[model samples]
Target: EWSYTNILTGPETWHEHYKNMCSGYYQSPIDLKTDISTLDLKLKTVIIYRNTSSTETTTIQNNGHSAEVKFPRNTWFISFDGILDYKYEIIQMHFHWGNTDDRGSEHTIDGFRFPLEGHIVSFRRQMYSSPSEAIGRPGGLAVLGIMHQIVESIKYEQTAFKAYNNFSGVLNSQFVPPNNSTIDDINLALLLSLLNPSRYFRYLGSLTTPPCTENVLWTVFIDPVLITREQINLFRNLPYGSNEKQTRMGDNFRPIQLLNPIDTLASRTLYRATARG
Candidate 1:
């Protein structure tokens, strides 16, 4: 029961109870500053949505920690030329938000945090068969991050809003701990159009949540997805079980792991890539 609020069970104490991975050198949700070096590579980024089911439905679940959307396996993936070595398959997509607009995102840029951040998580298909096996290996996970910026317009009705609006269904009206809902035709390729493939930061990190597995390859794009204030309010309204009980799920993100001791600086180089000559 690692909570974000409680001083005892919160992120600060996660390493004590969870595996040593939380305390490891390579952890996620880092502050990606602009001052880092950029990699001189990348052809283009093409994300495709392959539908297996006739309906193309994705599940939305309130897993007590965050609002998560589970996509059908093998139905979603991304393609990269030199930016990413493998064709990474989609695992699932989840969000990290805070109590307020300024504190929601997990990965901050140049010390500025966006209002919300969504992770379209994937696993290295060239290396693993399933997400289960992928978690235990280095660079097994390929997670593309979306940091959301709040706007006044509610017309932001991409499949992104289609997924975002469905959070109400699984709000656990009467202690439905495993609350679940569904959305059809979840076109992540359309959702990913918000980011620029040419400009991004890549690094090696761990899961932002428990198990906190290392070897996670992170690609946090430089663009901020536009979201309405009304839309993002939905995330904070989701409840938390940080106390081993339910409360408003504000500040659900893990603190950015800092680079202090030299040993803790795994992939601290933060390779940025541009899709240009």
Candidate 2:
């Protein structure tokens, strides 16, 4: 289960001032014009694969303090379960969008950025027999990223956006899909649409969280997904930093990660887009 710990202070001056002071502490939005041969190619392999299917409906909450009604299960996350024997647990999925519709995604492919992105974070799967045994080791996690964009239309409003809007206050609660469940109920189409056919960039990057550990298999899809205009509005209202008083919450996304020399992702190369199947 993934969780978010909002700083106790509201989005006020206290939180804003502190975050501004530490803006330099953030480590991404790396420009990609540099030569690549000099960078490291950290590699990891999928231990296995599984075919997870979506079912029923579930309910969930979001950061802006509302509930996501009629949400679907995370069945679309088939690869996640298939490789679980290795110890990578799908933690959570979050959105990254620009204030308007032009540029909010965290990665750029062939020099193009999208309006939004969704990161389905998974920790390294443990080869060990028990969960406790896998703590603090190399084979811990492999994070999967699916970049999202604004499409002219979609099957329905994206659930993540629905939850973000109505359930904004419940960021710390279980996101409910339709049929009174968590991620166990939903149609398979949700996952299929999300896992659209597209190439991606792979590398070894840190968790976008604190301690920003550099032990992850970062696979960012090349294409983008879409959402409605209302969805963007809800997320934009979030407070930027810990203190919480700061208001211009529209562009809360962190920048794209850098492809550094020591920090590299050479092994987990992008296969055919359908390779995910």
Candidate 3:
């Protein structure tokens, strides 16, 4: 029994403790139901939150399976100059990949699998960074989902490619942390250019995580970040646990669950339909 093995085998034997907590973690195979044809998105730049009191910037560190940078010092601010009306706080960002050469992403469109997905977690600024810090609670997060596709060829240089390429396993190995600090650095123009802002699918959904919170206004990027085959292989070799000789653990994704409606009336309608069964 390994603490971090294949998502199926290692689950019952290795890490039973994680069962309850992991049970509610967002599973994949989700319905990407955003009305793309009707979506007219005008995006503001994705910027880093700021704080005058904390001179110390956020730092990315190894968090077992993925890399995480916690910005406890700053107030994560999001300016949705685009289609979204509200601005939220940027909490953190994480990634998901696959086990084999095939599929690895969390959310899928009509059972189609992408290479990877990145979630920039945000919450209502009304909350504190932690339990002792502010008044905000869980359930409220503004997650920006970026889908990645594997390709044999590409152009331009990217630090995220460097980070994910070298990363492997459940949680081991160091990543080349991104250094750009200011919110202005994540501006819309640059993000769109990198993501080819022209091609994306947008939707209104809840956070993948629970309390299965249904308040999330999700903006999933349609165009994927292209990575070479070699890079994809590198990501597959990432370690999943302290053991397994740090072998390749495939598919760090969950099966997608039902999406709760954003509005109560809609939710009631869906609930009735579901209850009929």
Candidate 4:
């Protein structure tokens, strides 16, 4: 009965049943103001993925809430030397989008929101046996966030276009017959390389979804990728409700959580990492 639409069940009132939603000091989907962040030189992002035609199998599911892609194998991993002591293995990836081109991204910068956002979830391998266990431990998970803005053209030279093209296969698989289907030969390396990995805003935060666990190390890239308006329409058009209702899955983002001065996390400062040496 807990659907994302109903106010009683939505994120706004999640604390009613899930006490952690309100009590967790480190929550996500925060407004990142660069002016106030402290610049950190050691916060460099490093990714490791074997460049090959591995053709790893991935299952894409609607799940009646959001479209999530799950992999059978550990396709890649990421680490930040000074930020996280352990390397995190790639677990799954998903997206949050809006009904219109104006806004959809969960996190904002200076009160500005983007049309779409994507999350690459990873878990600390050394600290935990699996992602499920890692989700509940401090400094156990690392999530890479990428925001996408609408653009007029889809030039081949742009890295965004290359990444967006890979998504077309996953988008087309939605709303058809089987709720879950396999996509072949997805180059996760190419998709991740499109963003400015070296430049990002880092902080301790919770997952944007249910249970809202405060165990994630969030690193949201500073530069947004560009995608054509048409590409965004594909995401907004997907359905996310009962078979009868079948509501369009747009506006699938949680409202921003405030970083109040009185909260337990108020003492923690946000940090920005610039170009890597």
Candidate 5:
């Protein structure tokens, strides 16, 4: 299936193939605004990984939809009692970007788009047998989103640079036909550190793709991770495939889903957490 485009056959037509796209109440990729109501509670959540070593490896693939990397099961996970009782396992992480620096992120803050956005997808342990079984059930998935902004190299000299520098290696891997191959031995910890998950906005929503199941508990980080314009272009310029004329990949994000006023779940309170210095 073709990815998101602005024309008639874009995401608007996706429901023809996936019926849930037309009728999901808790759909995702909303225009997230600061919820002043939930800020007072100091809703802190922790993302603990069993292994933080740079030598730990994972698999990366250039899925035609986006470049996705899968985490080895049980090797890593996040525990945050503020949202759920059970720990969420790190299933995989992927990105949504644009053709330029101005507007690539799937979710926006008051209509402002970021250069890039990354999602750390996980599944709730107590509710489902596995991630696949959890797909359509409510409160089954928890996705942590981190937005990216381009900044001067001096400002990004420390964490962002070190993380992205290691990550660019995976993004530059050989084109594997959609879902057919993976680049092994890539450092998953180094790549994840760039997200800076310390401060974020939390909400309950759905998968931002077709078959839009209203199951994801979204934690979108408010503090952006800084990267340089050159580094941002590295993702914007990747080829979708090995074909000589493959479409240049970018704008692979879905349009914002409406936050329905009538649904209580859709109107649920949003919370934010900041890391203590």
Candidate 6:
């Protein structure tokens, strides 16, 4: 029953009800301030796309909290040099956006919230059999978060075009269209190409959702994927639940968790990967 907005099921209330890390140490979505972070010149983030096709099948679902696109397992693997030893497997990707344009992304840039954030979630294939097995364990998952901006210069996102145009059939968690959820010809390589991998923030954190597990490796790119305002509205207009009881998904992101520098588990360091060593 955890939600992004309800007073009862919302994040503010999670700290009190569960024994989870939501209220404790190593939480995620903290404000990533460059001034406070150490620039790691040797940190090299690499994603090797082992699976890329003109006909890739991906599924989108409105899970009541947010819309997520599910991908075929082991689609690709990623390796981070100078930081981690495991080549993480790319498992899935999803988005988080606000009801409005000002604040939507989970992680903030120097305390500023962006319009949207996309999480390219992967797990440590060297140790875990599945993402489920990886959750909560240290070095279990690595998520690449890409923030989005609405600009008129470059409006159409070809890769996201496959995802945004197909949500009409999926209005709720229980009623996804049978065998028709796949969107073909999505170009993630092109989408990811827009990023400058050397410019990003890395940290040790946890899931933003319930049972709010820790030990997740987070990498949020400094560059944003630009899209038009209409593309953002495509998400803002979607119902949070169902047509039966309609409500927009609103700002589908957890609020920024404060950084505590003194508490060992609660005090995690934010590292920046830069080309200039």
Clashes of each: 1, 56, 25, 0, 0, 0
Q: Write the per-residue lDDT of candidate 5 for residues 125-183, one digit (tens) a residue.
A: 76687878776677889898878788765554454546534454555435544643434
Return the TM-score for each candidate structure.
0.87, 0.56, 0.61, 0.88, 0.82, 0.85
Model 5 worst lDDT window (10 residues): 179-188
Q: What is the lDDT, from 0 to 100, of the residue 90 in candidate 4?
A: 79
- Candidate 6 residues lying further than 4 Å off, grouped into runs, are 52-56, 82-86, 155-180, 242-246, 261-266
The segments of candidate 4 whose C-alpha lies over 4 angstroms from its true place after superposition are 51-56, 82-86, 156-161, 168-178, 243-246
Q: Report the C-alpha lDDT of model 3 over 192-271, residue by residue, as the tens digit.
A: 34564444444445444322344555656666666666665655544454433335545656556545424334421110
Predict model 1's lDDT versus the native: 0.73
What root-mean-square deviation over C-alphas does model 4 reach? 3.1
In model 1, where is the ten-residue run with the lowest total lDDT? 168-177
TM-score of 5: 0.82
Candidate whose TM-score is highest: 4
lDDT of 2 by residue, 92-195 (tens): 45565666777766556645666666665554434544323432355555555556566556655564344233343433213222112244332323443544
Candidate 6 local accuracy as lDDT? 0.72
Global Cα RMSD, each model? 3.0, 8.2, 8.2, 3.1, 3.9, 3.9
> What's the ranking of the predictions by TM-score, best on top?
4, 1, 6, 5, 3, 2
Question: Model 3 residue 17 lDDT?
Answer: 40
Of 4 and 6, which scores higher on TM-score?
A: 4
Per-residue accuracy of model 6 over 42-63 as CA lDDT, tens digit each: 7875554655442456676666
Note the Cα lDDT for every prediction shown: 0.73, 0.43, 0.49, 0.74, 0.69, 0.72
TM-score of 6: 0.85
Task: Using lDDT, rank the candidates from best to worst.
Answer: 4, 1, 6, 5, 3, 2
Clashing pairs in 6: none
Candidate 4 backbone collisions, by pair: none
Stretches of candidate 2 off by over 4 Å are 1-87, 128-137, 153-189, 239-245, 261-277
